[PDB]
């Protein structure tokens, strides 16, 4: 499975998933928000046998989500 970080709020795993979908079969998209207001922040865990895309779109760092940056890494 792959990680994230910095999914904004407004954010949902539907985002992550539908997102990496497209990258890899993504059978599991999760996404974790901060705590109550502890949107700042964000931690994901999502998955697709499709390591070829997670050896890419998991280095850089600047991904688009729904519309954040946030960073992603082949977990």
């Known amino acids: 499975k792959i990680f994230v970080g910095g999914l904004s709020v407004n954010t949902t795993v539907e985002d992550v998933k539908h997102y990496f979908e497209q990258f890899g079969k993504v059978d599991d998209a999760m996404l974790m928000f901060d705590k ?3 949107r700042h922040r964000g931690f994901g865990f999502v998955t697709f046998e499709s390591e070829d895309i997670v050896e890419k779109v998991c280095e850089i760092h600047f991904h688009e989500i729904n519309n954040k940056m946030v960073e ?3 977990a």
């Open 36 to 38: 109550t207001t502890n």
């Open 72 to 74: 992603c890494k082949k």
